[PDB]
Design a protein around this nucleic acid. Structure first.
Lengths: 106, 79, 92, 96, 95, 104, 81, 93
DNA sequence: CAGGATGTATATATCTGACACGTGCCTGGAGACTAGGGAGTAATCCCCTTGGCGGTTAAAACGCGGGGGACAGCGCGTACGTGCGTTTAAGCGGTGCTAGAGCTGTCTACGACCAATTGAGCGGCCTCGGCACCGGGATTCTCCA
DNA sequence: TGGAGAATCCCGGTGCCGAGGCCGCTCAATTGGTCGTAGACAGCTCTAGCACCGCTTAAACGCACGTACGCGCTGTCCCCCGCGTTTTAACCGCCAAGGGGATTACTCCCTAGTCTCCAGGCACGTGTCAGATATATACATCCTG
C-alpha cells in the first residue's frame, strides 16, 4: 500500500509529491517524477555515505561526525566539483602543504 | 575600542591555518578591513530580511538564506 | 510539528554500513544537503518546463535536469539507476 | 631552542586534523552586535545565529588564506605582504 | 502570423521622454530588453522565495519592497524604493 | 483606460501583472505588487539611457551603439557591482593601462 | 587527426591579449590557451546539447545557448529573445 | 625598427575598438567537432554559433585581465603559462 | 650521520549526555471517483541551415636580427619568531525576567474565475536621414643623426 | 638638439540601409460581477535571550633579540618583439536543395480536486555506552653536534 514499497526505495514518494506540489514549481506535475527524484537522491545519498563510512573506517571511529563528511566531499575529485561552492559546518580543512615550503638537506 | 574585538594572536591562528611560515605586520589591520566589509554585507541583507518577518531577533534560520543570495549556501543549522 | 528527513537516510546508512552510527550534528549536515539538492534539481526542472512552454512535469523532463547539474561519472550512473527504478514501477 | 619556522610546520599538522572553531566566541558576540545596533536599533540574536556567523567568517578567512598562500608562493616569497590580499580580491572579482 | 512580445516601443518612448533627440539601434534595444527581462526575473524570483519562506501565498508591496532592498546596492536602492513608493501612493490615491 | 494611466507611469502594469499570474512565482499576487514592479523597472531602464545619452554626446553620435551601454555600466561602480556577472555583447572593455606597464 | 583545435592561429591569441592589457607574451602560452578555451567550451556546449536533446530538436538555437551560460553564472545579453 | 612603439600602440587601439578577435570559421569548424563528441549529425543556427564566439573571448579578455595582474605581482612584464595556472586556481575553477 | 630533548601518537579507566529505540496519537498518505484540458500525434509549408564555387585581398606564416627583460646571484638591513614573564578577560556555572515568537480563532476585503467590450499593441511596408566609406590634407612624435 | 617618415585625426562628399513611423488588423487588457479564503488582528501562552556576578585559568599582551628573509643592484643571455617577404585561406555573393522547426487540428488519457479513511512519522521519554578527557608510555621528529 505504501508507494515507496511499490517502487523499492527509502525516500517516500508521497512526501516528495506534496512538497514538489506545495513548492509551486509547476501547476501540473506528474506521478513518475516524484518516483524518479527520490531515486536520484537515493543514489546521491548512497555515494556520500559510502565515502563517509570509508572515512569513518580508517579513522577507526564507528560514529560519523561532520569531520568525516568533510573527508567524504573533499577527497573525491568529482563531487567537490558539484558542491565545492558549499561550506560545511564543523568540517575542517584538507591536509595540504606545498612541497616548496618544506626544507631540504635534512 | 569595541571595534578591536578581533584579537591579534587569533589572526595568527587564521594565518597559521593558512600554512605560511612568516606573517607581515600590516596584514592584521588589512584583514580587519576586508572581513568587516564581508560581515557588513551579510547583515546588510539579513537584517532587512529579519525586518520583513515582523521580527526583531535574527534567528539561525533567516541568516542561511542571506548567504545563499550572496552565493555561499551553508549547511548544518537547517535550510 | 517540525518534520525532517531523520529516519529515511538512517535506513540507507544501515543498508550499506549496518554497524555504524551518525551524530545529530552530522544528521543536520546530511538533512540540509538533501534539502538543498531538493530545490536545486527541482528548481532547474521548474524553469526548464517553462522554457519550451510545457506546463506538465514528466519523469522524462526531470531526467535532463539531472544531466545538467552533476558532472560526468555521477551524471551517467544516476540516470541509469533511476530508469530501472521507474521501469519496474510502471510494470506493477 | 628551535630553529624558527620549524615549529610553524609542527603547529601545521595539529591544525590540519582539528576542526574546533578558531577565534573566540564572545569577543565575536560584541563585534557583530555593535554593527547591528548601529544598523537598526533594538536588534536581538539567537545564540545559534552567531554560531552560524563564526563558521561563516572563518570559512571566508581560511579559504582566502590558502588562496593568497599560493599567490605568495608565485612571488617566490614566504611572507604575505598585503599586496597579495588586494590581488586575491581582484582576481576573485569581489572588489574590482 | 506569429506573436512575439517585446518592450521595444516601451524603452523607445522612455528614451524619447528623457532624451528626445537620441536614437537607439535595434541591437541596442535587444540588450535593453534582455537586461530588463533579466532584472525582472531576478526580482520576481527573489520575491517568490521570500514569500515562500514566510509561509505567505501572496506577494504584496512589502515583499517586493524587501526584495528590492535585498537586490539593489545602497543609494540606487533607496532612490528606487522612494520613487516606487511615490508611484504606489499615487496609484492608491486615484481610482 | 489602462492601469498605467491611473498610476501615471509609462511601462505597462497589465503586461507585468499578466506574467505575474502564469509566471508561477506564487499563485496569488497582491494589487500593488505589479504596480511596484513596473515602477522599479521604470528607473532601471532610465538609469541607463541618461548614462548612455551622456556617453552619446561624448562621442557626438545621435544613435546609441552597443558600445555606449557597455560604458554606461562599466564606468560606474554602483552599476558594475550589480552587473558584474554578466557580459554585454559587442561592447568591448573600457580602456585601462597600468602605470607600471607605461614606459619612462 | 586534423588541425581543428589549432584552427585558431598565432595572431588570434595575440589580438585577445592586447584587449586584455598585457605587455609581453610567451610562445609556450599558446597551446595551453587552446586547452583552456576547449575545456570552457567542453562545459558550455555540453549544457546546450542537453537542452537541445530535451526540446526534441537536432539544431541548437540561439536561445538555449544563452541559458547554458546562465547556468554557469556567465550570463549573456543581446540574444535572450 | 621601432622598439616599444608598436608594443604600446596595439593595446590602445584594441581596448578602444569593438571588433572581434576570434576568427569565424576556425571557431565555426571547431564547435562542430566538439559537439560531434557528444551527439552525431548536429545542426547549428547562425546566431547560435555566433553567440558562442563573443561568449568565448569575453571570458578570455577577462581572463587576460587576471594574468596581467599576476605578471606585475611577480615584478615581470612577460606572462608565463603558470600565470594561467595561477588565476584559474585563484578565481575558483 | 648522531645523541639527546622533547611534541606527537598510543593505551586503558571512566562517565555522561547525546544516541538509538519505544508509545501513541494525529494529521498527512492513500484509495476512490469524476472532469476536462495539456499534451500526444500528425500533416503541411517555409524559413533557414547547409553546401559549393570563385574572385579578392586582408591577413596568416616564416625567417632573421637585435636589444631589452628574466633570472641567478649577491649584499645588506630589518622584521618577525620563539621564548618568557605579565596582564586580561575568555569562558563556566547559576538565577531571573521579561520581551516577544507561536498558538488560537473570528472576520472581511481582496483577488480569483468569468463574459464582453474594445483600443493598446504589432506585423508589415514605405521613406529618408544618419552614418560608415572613399579619398585627400592637416597634425603629432618617436627614432635617426 | 633638428628631421623625416610612420601613424593618427579630421574634413568633404556620398550612397546605402537601418531606424522610424504610419496603416490596417487583432488579441489580451479592462470593466463589471461574485465568493471564499488568505491574511490581518488581537488576545493568551511560555520559551528563550539578555543580563548581572564571581572564579579560575588559558590565552592574550608586552618585551627581547638573532637570523634568515625581503628588497635593491647588477650582469648575462636568449627569447621575444618587430619588420619584410611569401603564403594562406577568409569574405561576399551568387545559386541549389531539402530538413526539420513551427503552426493548425483532433482525442484522450491522466492528473487536479473532493470525499473518505487509515497508518507511519513525529513529540515525549528512556537508558546506555562511545568517544572526550586524562596521565603514563613509546616514538619519531629536529637541534647543535
Amino acid at each position: 500500500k505504501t508507494r515507496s514499497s511499490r517502487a523499492g526505495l527509502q525516500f517516500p514518494v508521497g512526501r516528495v509529491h506534496r512538497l514538489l506540489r506545495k513548492g509551486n514549481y509547476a501547476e501540473r506535475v506528474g506521478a513518475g517524477a516524484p518516483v524518479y527524484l527520490a531515486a536520484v537522491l537515493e543514489y546521491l545519498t548512497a555515494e556520500i555515505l559510502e565515502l563517509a563510512g570509508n572515512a569513518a573506517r580508517d579513522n577507526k571511529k564507528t560514529r560519523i561526525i561532520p569531520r568525516h563528511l568533510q573527508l567524504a566531499v573533499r577527497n573525491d575529485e568529482e563531487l567537490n566539483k558539484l558542491l565545492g561552492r558549499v561550506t560545511i559546518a564543523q568540517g575542517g580543512v584538507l591536509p595540504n602543504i606545498q612541497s616548496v615550503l618544506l626544507p631540504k638537506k635534512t | 575600542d569595541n571595534i578591536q574585538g578581533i584579537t591579534k594572536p587569533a589572526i595568527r591562528r587564521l594565518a597559521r591555518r593558512g600554512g605560511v611560515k612568516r606573517i607581515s605586520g600590516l596584514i592584521y589591520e588589512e584583514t580587519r578591513g576586508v572581513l568587516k566589509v564581508f560581515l557588513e554585507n551579510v547583515i546588510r541583507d539579513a537584517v532587512t530580511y529579519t525586518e520583513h518577518a515582523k521580527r526583531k531577533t535574527v534567528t539561525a534560520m533567516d541568516v542561511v538564506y542571506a548567504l545563499k543570495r550572496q552565493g555561499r549556501t551553508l549547511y548544518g543549522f537547517g535550510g | 510539528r517540525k518534520e525532517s528527513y531523520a529516519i529515511y537516510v538512517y535506513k540507507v546508512l544501515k543498508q550499506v554500513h549496518p554497524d555504524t552510527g551518525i551524530s545529530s550534528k552530522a544528521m543536520s549536515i546530511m538533512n540540509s544537503f538533501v534539502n538543498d539538492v531538493f530545490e536545486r534539481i527541482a528548481g532547474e526542472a521548474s524553469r526548464l518546463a517553462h522554457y519550451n512552454k510545457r506546463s506538465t512535469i514528466t519523469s522524462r523532463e526531470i531526467q535532463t535536469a539531472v544531466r545538467l547539474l552533476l558532472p560526468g561519472e555521477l551524471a551517467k550512473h544516476a540516470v541509469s539507476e533511476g530508469t530501472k527504478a521507474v521501469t519496474k514501477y510502471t510494470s506493477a | 631552542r628551535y630553529r624558527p619556522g620549524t615549529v610553524a610546520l609542527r603547529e601545521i599538522r595539529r591544525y590540519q586534523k582539528s576542526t574546533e572553531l578558531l577565534i573566540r566566541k564572545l569577543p565575536f558576540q560584541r563585534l557583530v552586535r555593535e554593527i547591528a545596533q548601529d544598523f537598526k536599533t533594538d536588534l536581538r540574536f539567537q545564540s545559534s545565529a552567531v554560531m552560524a556567523l563564526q563558521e561563516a567568517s572563518e570559512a571566508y578567512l581560511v579559504a582566502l588564506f590558502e588562496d593568497t598562500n599560493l599567490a605568495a608562493i608565485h612571488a617566490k616569497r614566504v611572507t604575505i605582504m598585503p599586496k597579495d590580499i588586494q590581488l586575491a580580491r581582484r582576481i576573485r572579482g569581489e572588489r574590482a
